[model samples]
Target: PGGRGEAQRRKEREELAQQYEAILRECGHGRFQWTLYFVLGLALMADGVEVFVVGFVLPSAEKDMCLSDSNKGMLGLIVYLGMMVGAFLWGGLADRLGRRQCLLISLSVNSVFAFFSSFVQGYGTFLFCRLLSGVGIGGSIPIVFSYFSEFLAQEKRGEHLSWLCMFWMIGGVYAAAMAWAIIPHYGWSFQMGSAYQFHSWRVFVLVCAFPSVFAIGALTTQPESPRFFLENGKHDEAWMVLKQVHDTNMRAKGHPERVFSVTHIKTIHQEDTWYQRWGVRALSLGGQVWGNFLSCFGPEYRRITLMMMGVWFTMSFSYYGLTVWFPDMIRHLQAVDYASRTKVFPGERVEHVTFNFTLENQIHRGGQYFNDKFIGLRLKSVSFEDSLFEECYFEDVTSSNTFFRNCTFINTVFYNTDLFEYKFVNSRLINSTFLHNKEGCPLDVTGTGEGAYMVYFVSFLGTLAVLPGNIVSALLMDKIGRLRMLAGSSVMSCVSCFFLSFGNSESAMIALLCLFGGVSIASWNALDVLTVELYPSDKRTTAFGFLNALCKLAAVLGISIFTSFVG
Candidate 1:
């Protein structure tokens, strides 16, 4: 095959084909002969578009719908709720159905719903579409990850994941550009015409439909999973897939090879009866459920899963709390002197509502119809007022979004310094205390905390998250492994209740927040990675759907639970 005789080339092709068949034989699928990675990758990219755009469109949507700050946060919570359900359900669906079908359906459903959302004239209708988008998007991520990870060689998984991230980023970029280009030049109403016409946002959403284009083509070009094929008694087809893999690799290197044989693949023993097969499937499902449950607890899962639980909780508390509630926080500015310099007179003070309205209008640029009917109050002037918060303490005050980030501040009672716009990007404290105040006693907190500390905290928690549950599965998957961490994280999150209840001081509260962040990050990171490794490429999209659906289910429940708490 290396520029040798024709006979050598023929032998190489045969050998390559044999090697391909061997993997299929081992997995037990002999009838499969297709690749689904491209489709899954593209689907994930499409799903990510929904994630990134929400942050971008929040402002526009708020003004268009005349939404309150709390209302805005509720929307995010709602979307996430849908995402959680989608993740869990799709994961299961993928296991039952083929990956391509799941992916294609998910993309199509998401596209249709999101496109229609542009025409929503009310918050209720708009949020419903957001929820639908969330479900579809939620289904896409895990399934794609699972499928892609299965296809790659063990050594290449990380690289594949990284590259996949790039695709997601690219999709976000496309979404951002589309939103920016179409929204400003054309008024929001013009952006999306009416029920009959499609606007830029609608177009952006419909772009999701195109992924199904790849998905439909995937049905023809792709084969059933070799793993699934083998389990289903299609050994020969599985061999074809393996052969294709080896042949493609060799061809890429300018080495021709023949089809691979079954000897190279693993042999899966068939069950004695249909019931036995059903039992096996049941076991697999059980494992999935158990694995998910164990992924949360530190006591049951390895240290890694525990850590992940911490990170997830922490990130969820901090990131979600901040982002989902950001508009509310921003709106609070009108009640304070953060914009006193541009203050409206006594009679015109109501005009400040107009200012806030304007700010909201500029950011959320989604939906065409709402723009034309947009109405709200805005802040006429901004002024810094003094504060009476002598007993209150502010620590780790910084410009950066992360906790304990470096920050400059003007006079306040305790942590007062020169505060400027550069400090809080896209944000400002509405409290008038920043204008001038008597420097109060220093609290236990300081601005000396490192930004990298938080980043490191996040990363470490992430690494630890996968370690207990995921890495344990990786090491002893087929042997003896207990899935206990799945439920641990959720149980641990109850700690937040304690933090909220007993955290009397800012230092104590912040500490609690960080701890929660670490645990939460760890759990999610590990589980996400593990789920990706669990499935085969052909079934990835479907598997992702199931996993995401479950997650969405959890999210939906979570939303209800948390909202109940708030209520």
Candidate 2:
């Protein structure tokens, strides 16, 4: 036997590393992996942008149409319905064809459809475009995971998958931050034709489609899944993809001359059946795809399949349900904490507003005496406790959130004076008319205060909350295992939600919401890893697609179910 000589050891090692999975381990995780992630992650991020951009699109769209809510429920329903249909179609198609090919088609569909949404003349056209776009968006999401996971080493798979989901939070932050910048300004909006009112919402929709555009360009630079090729009887193609992976990775380590030494993975057999090639192809194609769906519920996979359905349903229902409800939450905040912190948008620069003088948040107590011309003058949130207003000629003047408590007005003429949310407790208005002046536009406008603080800023903060949480999740995933990490995050999320109900203060609600966001996203990160890892590569995307389709179904149900609570 030669007592395990060097020659015998070398032969054993070669045999051990001969298979495709082994050779993948030989290529290892490095530059190629990270490059793959960023390219893949951006596509995943585009899906996020597609989903979240709708809320930003919704308000200005409604502002343009100015209608009653006859078509309100349908706008939300149609997108999910499209997604539900799209996920099943694209996910199945990818397995039959190829992941790379399917993504190219879906990305084109999503980007072009969303672009069309930007130029729409009415709700019908816009809704039509969104439904079309939702199909592509839904199709791309599960495939991204399917394509991305196959490239990773077994040890690194969970962590990389978790990181992939991080792009989604980045997507939301990008969407919210951009919506903050683009949506408010009534500037740069022009109608192309008719009374269509091609306003800023159109521009915002145009803006959202761009990530998919960028993703398409980057995706072209990468290779298709070698694993897909290997399984599909394309041995040489799989080998070439591996060599490509090895070349790029080895180059990163300054080993430019080190060739992929191990060749020909014939150890992994490719059984290309006659029916797969020669039969009535469409019948076999559709039949094979239909077979893939039922295989997930085998005694082997049935447990994980059932677990994922509940997780996906709960995650989708809560995450999307709260987002559309966010703006309304700000309205209640105005009541308890009135002017505690007002974002000072300094004027009515709209439709040519005339203001002789505008005094904002000015404090005037037991003071002032002089002839003050008050034509087209404004006072916003001015504290005037026990002040003497003498010889003030007021005409076309407006006041809001102003305190005129115990103030004596002498020789003050208040003709056509606008009183908005102002207090005149125990105050004298001498020689003043009692007419409610028509509300003039603010001297300056809600430039930054386009009510974005309550909506977009809140969204950004919530998105920010998840960044560190996901990192913590990804890092701890393998060591603690996926199920434990998911269970823990779910527990923390429940705790956060429970505490959230009792928090009456605005700060308390925000903090609890951040807590909920952080923990809840960790759950998502864990779920993404589990979604990819739980099934065999052959059935992975279909399982994920079906799960996601189910998730979207719950999201639709959630919007309907929670409509009454928020409505």
Candidate 3:
């Protein structure tokens, strides 16, 4: 089915693949590659930790700094904004300065800024530090994916990339577990009587920064990508890196005397000048940056670039939208449960006994509940419909214009209780008396109704529902192919999200929330792998960086609008 030109091009690419494969044959997946893989995984982990730790930090930070809801919203926005800047800047730098240098610099800067975030005294400074960390996170995420992908054979790329994605989960679990261990036990403030205080959330942040340091240490000992060196026309340096990989593998396998043959390797294109090769016209750094960025918009690349941006933005929005809102929603459910439970009558030992009564138009029900100290308590113009009152004694109580129709009272006593201006129409009062039946006066009664039911379990279950889908995604990403997996999972996510919006019951709503999280997270994982695959090695980091920046932008918008809408 192929013409002579197509046949020739295919032969050329086969030769290219063979050359790289021969070089990698010596490198193999030995101790050195494994270490490099883990280090890159750690780099991915750091990004994951940075993105999610804020979720844990915000609640504690909010209380400490008295952050308004809007300020809290800005906390998310600032970090994502910082990431957008970092991703673009660092990603572009990877293409120009090389992935190794960009990664090391990003890690170092991220570590310093993340650690400094702990010492911030005010909201502005705290936000500033998070912004800086976001930059580091943004920069690191794409390079780690691109860098690791470059080191592997094309056939093995998807598998290793899946492994790297797993580290993302590791970082997430670690952040959650670390926060669980540190925050609840250590949030007790130590105040210096007036001027200073140390909070536990600060400790949590400082602890999270240590991973970046470890990552930098690992990265420092690794060699730069040979592909990067070749792209920049550093052939000798590229050979040196490959030889190092060969020697490391040989030594690790007890064949220190083995030699790596670099004879068959060939550069695809020869350059007459740096300007002609690197595609940079101006000498300035800004021009170089723009040049690197514009490379992705070339006709062959433009479609993939747009596709990645769409995927990145969509995944980031769905991913962060759930993660960011999880804790807040849990807290909201907690608050609702607390209000429902503790708002009971004081000094009353009331137990569960059902008596059906439809209730509404009750003014003071949503407010404070009072106990039975009644000599004379007044209830006016109240309707107790579709409500249940059980096991209550109403002695010397009075109410006016109180409609207790379609209501039921069980095991109840009402002696010397005046039903003044009260209507018990269609109400079944069992073992209940109204001795002083003086009509047209205010009377008081007490018991259970619609206000007593709390739907907090839904929130609790939703929080537990995210892990299953993530596990499925990690398992299937390589086998199914990145684009296919994402396409399918995104459709599943959309369905779940729809149910989340129109779910009729509390259980259905919570289950849908969980399904949404699982499928959406899987979609993001697939997209991450796809991002590394869709671009060439030369522009991989730049493409990833651009896409990562757009993702953060989408996240900021999504989180802000979501929280604002929910609030």
Candidate 4:
């Protein structure tokens, strides 16, 4: 009976505490919310710029740092890996120390490390700076999202988050635009030390730091998310933040009210720490964190957590891999002296990548599209419906479970490109060129300089493409539902990858990439809103961090795999 009464009392107090949304509704969507929208969005943009800046930096960075291709590849990988770790570290810390403190810490740390990365004399030091810079970016995302979302009423939160996502695209475009300006024309170098010559790449990196620092300045003016206070033993301060917002809103609207009051608030209390003292209290709070983390997989949360985590992984795989690689690829493609452009790839070919290789059920697939290049690749379980492959070489490729339905191969050299447990339904090959070999295939490398400046311009257009994608997401996130927005975008990007597989010419390839850029972002905007909405206030920041950590992990894997095979 005693335990029963105590449990009821706790439940009642928790109910009182949950009225934060009710109080938030009174605060209304006004100057205060927009202030948060801009500042938090700015914070997210800084993270984006730092991440995208790496791609542009890599092409020139190899010269200054004397890096091999492998070394160049590692730089982006290290950043994403560091981001994975930092997400957990800073996210959990935000839960303990409050969102405001961690937000400032992340931006300050990000700005500092990113600035230091530029002046370094060696690759190791540069790599180190990138690692820490990524960590700072990682920490900022979870804290920023949770803090900003808490200020909004549920109805408006999804739309606002979509709006905020556009800033990431904007930051990317800004990075590319700046690269176009600084990397090519403003190539001045000066000695900082006996060994150091600070040039365009260094200057570009240095300029990128300003955005993060500027965000910190904007954030410092704002109060912590009041939702944080309600759950963390500062009941009075929670009400105070709400009251402050209410007063701020009223005064701005030209109807000032002095006696803004919240009823039955005193009944809500944090008994966990009020009676505890010093070290004991700190330990107790810290101890509670692990349970809070583990509870994310509790039966109530198991389904959404796993699904969002899956989407997070695949999204990062597509996104980071593309962003970091595209610029360098463009530079190489543009740099070709093509006998000069027609035969751009000058002497870097393996006649046969591998011989006597075996495959069974290991092949997955995308539809067949060819431009006198290697196709289908190491893929599986797909359709090549109504495709026409002309002058294609399918040499020593073993594939499975792919439909060659209604596809006609024209004037092709098919040397041992065989299929196992696969159907060639209604699909016939060109006259007289068929040989089979599983696990032994010839790979094609498309050969490349204005490539560097061209990359900047293309990347700028790619970033702009996402602007339209984001606006549709923000309006339709609520209108169509987050789930459908997410699913449709994911499927559209499949079509994007479909045609993207065989970009016949430079012009077509650039257009395909831009289409991919704009279409894929809908999923990102949809996922961010859904993930945040799916979670609760207490576990929200940590969950976001967890999702981001795995997201970065997938990104690290994606970049490395492509780099490994491409070489």
Judging by TM-score against the true structure, name the best candidate. Answer: 2
lDDT of 4 by residue, 390-469 (tens): 55565545443344455555676655554422245466654435545443222111111223545676677767766765
- TM-score of every prediction relative to native: 0.49, 0.71, 0.67, 0.71
Candidate 2 error regions (>4 Å): 1-18, 55-61, 66-68, 188-197, 254-261, 265-284, 298-300, 314-317, 324-328, 334-454, 476-505, 564-567
> Ranking by lDDT, best first?
2, 4, 3, 1
Worst 10 residues of 1 by lDDT: 360-369
Could you give me the TM-score of model 1 versus the true structure?
Answer: 0.49
Minimum summed lDDT over a 10-residue window in model 4 is located at: 441-450
Q: If the candidates were sorted by their TM-score against the true structure, best first, what order would they fall in?
A: 2, 4, 3, 1
lDDT (C-alpha) at residue 551 in model 4: 79
Candidate 3 local lDDT, 242-262, one digit each (tens): 767766777566543343433
Question: Every model's Cα RMSD, please?
Answer: 18.1, 10.8, 13.5, 16.7
What is the clash tally of candidate 1?
139
Model 3 misplaced stretches (Cα beyond 4 Å): 1-18, 66-69, 187-195, 251-259, 262-283, 341-469, 480-516, 560-567
Candidate 1 lDDT, tens digit per residue, 500-551?
6775533333344334434443444445555455433334444444444444
Per-residue lDDT for 307-386 in model 2, tens only? 88877876774566345654456534633354565444432222233445565666555446443434455655655555
